[PDB]
Paper text:
pmcAmyotrophic lateral sclerosis/parkinsonism-dementia complex ([name]/[name] or lytico-bodig) is a fatal disease found in the Chamorro population of Guam (1–4), some families on the Kii peninsula of Japan, and the Auyu and Jakai people of New Guinea. Abundant filamentous amyloid inclusions that are made of all six brain tau isoforms are characteristic of [name]/[name]. We now show that tau filaments from Guam and Kii [name]/[name] adopt the [name] fold in brain and spinal cord. The greater heterogeneity of amyloid filaments, when compared to [name] and SSPE, probably reflects the fact that [name]/[name] is a multiple proteinopathy based on neuropathology, as suggested for cases from the Kii peninsula.
In addition to tau filaments, we also observed singlets and doublets of [name] ([name]) filaments (fold I) in the frontal cortex from cases 1 and 2, and [name] singlets (fold I) in the spinal cord from case 2. Senile plaques have been described in around 60% of cases of Guam [name]/[name] and assembly of Aβ is believed to be part of the disease process. Alternatively, these changes may be age-related. This was probably also the reason for the presence of [name] filaments in two cases from Guam and one case from the Kii peninsula.
Residue numbers in the entry:
A (entry chain D), B (entry chain B), C (entry chain A), D (entry chain C): 120 to 254
The structure:
Amino acid sequence: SIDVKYIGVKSAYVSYDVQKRTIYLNITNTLNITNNNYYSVEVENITAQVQFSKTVIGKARLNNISIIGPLDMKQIDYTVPTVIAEEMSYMYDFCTLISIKVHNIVLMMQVTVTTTYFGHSEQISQERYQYVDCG
Amino acid sequence: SIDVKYIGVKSAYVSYDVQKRTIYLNITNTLNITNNNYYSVEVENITAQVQFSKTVIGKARLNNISIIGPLDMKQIDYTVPTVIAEEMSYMYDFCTLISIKVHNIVLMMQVTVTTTYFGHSEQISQERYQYVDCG
Amino acid sequence: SIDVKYIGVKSAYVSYDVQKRTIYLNITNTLNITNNNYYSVEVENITAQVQFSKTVIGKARLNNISIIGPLDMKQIDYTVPTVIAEEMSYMYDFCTLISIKVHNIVLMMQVTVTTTYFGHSEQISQERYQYVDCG
Amino acid sequence: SIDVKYIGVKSAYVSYDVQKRTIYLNITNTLNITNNNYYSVEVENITAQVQFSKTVIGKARLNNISIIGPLDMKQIDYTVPTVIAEEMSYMYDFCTLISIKVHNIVLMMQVTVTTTYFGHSEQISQERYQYVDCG
């Protein structure tokens, strides 16, 4: 990666930005830029590359063979009861969240039993997150 | 990746942006830019590449063979009861969320039993997220 | 990827944007740009590439063989009862959400039992997300 | 990908945009642009490419063989009862959502038992999402 960046408000190369109650007067701004960029990125020079896989099974006796991959979930219970009994009563609820198994972002890449891989793999996340606001 | 960026409000190369209660007066802005960019990115020079797979099964006796891939979910229970009993009562609910198994973004890539792979793989997420707002 | 970007409000190369209660007066803006861009991206020079697969089964005896792929879901229960009993009572509900299994974006790519792959694979998500607003 | 971007409000190359209660007076804006762009993208120079698949089955005895692909769903139950009993009572509901299995965007690509693939594959999502608003 090159130049992965989180900027909260503002980006510039060059900035003369003015705000609020300003007297900006008799100004000379003179700017001579020479900004050149040369990226040579993820450049391969390969003569041979081989990804060979071979499985021989002879005069074998295989039995009861179980290959289970990743992220197996079995026998999982969420029990979240709510009861509200009221006699002769005043209830006031505001901004009340029951949240179960609540995801924002899920990135999965190369999630396997077997993997042969050759090259570049990349995950980038950039974010402002706010779960709850209440005034 | 090159130049992956999260900017909250504003981006410029060059900015003379003015705001609010300003007197901007007798100004000379002079700007000479030479900004050149040269990207050579993900450039392959390959003579040979081979992805060979071979499976031989001889005079074998295979039995009860189970290959289960990733993200298997089995026997999963969400029990979320709500009961509201009221006698002679005043209830006031505002901004009340029961959220079960609530996803925003799911990216899946190369999610497998077996994978042979040659090259570039990439996931990028950029976001403002806000789950709840209530005033 | 090159130049993947989330800008919250505004982008410019060059900006002289003015706002609100401004006196912008006797201004000389002079701008000489030379901005050139040269992309050489995902460029392949390959003489040979082979994706060979071979499966031989000899004088074999295969029995009870089960290959299950990814994201298998079995025996899953969502029990979300709501009961509201009221005698002699005043109920007031506002902005009440029961959300079960609520997705925004699902991207799936190369989700398999077996995969041979050669090249570039990519997922990009960019978004403003807001689940609930209520004033 | 090149130049994948989310801009919340406005984009320009060059901007002199003015707003609100402005006196914009005696202005000279002079702009000399030379902005050239050269894209060489996803360019293949391949002499040979082969995608060979071969399946031989000899004097074999295959029995009870089950290949199940991805995203199998079996025995899934959503039980979401609502009961509202009222005697001698005042109910007021506003902005009440029961949402079950509610999707926005689903992109699926190369979702398979077997796949041989050669080249570029891509998914891009860009969006403003708002589930609920109520004032």
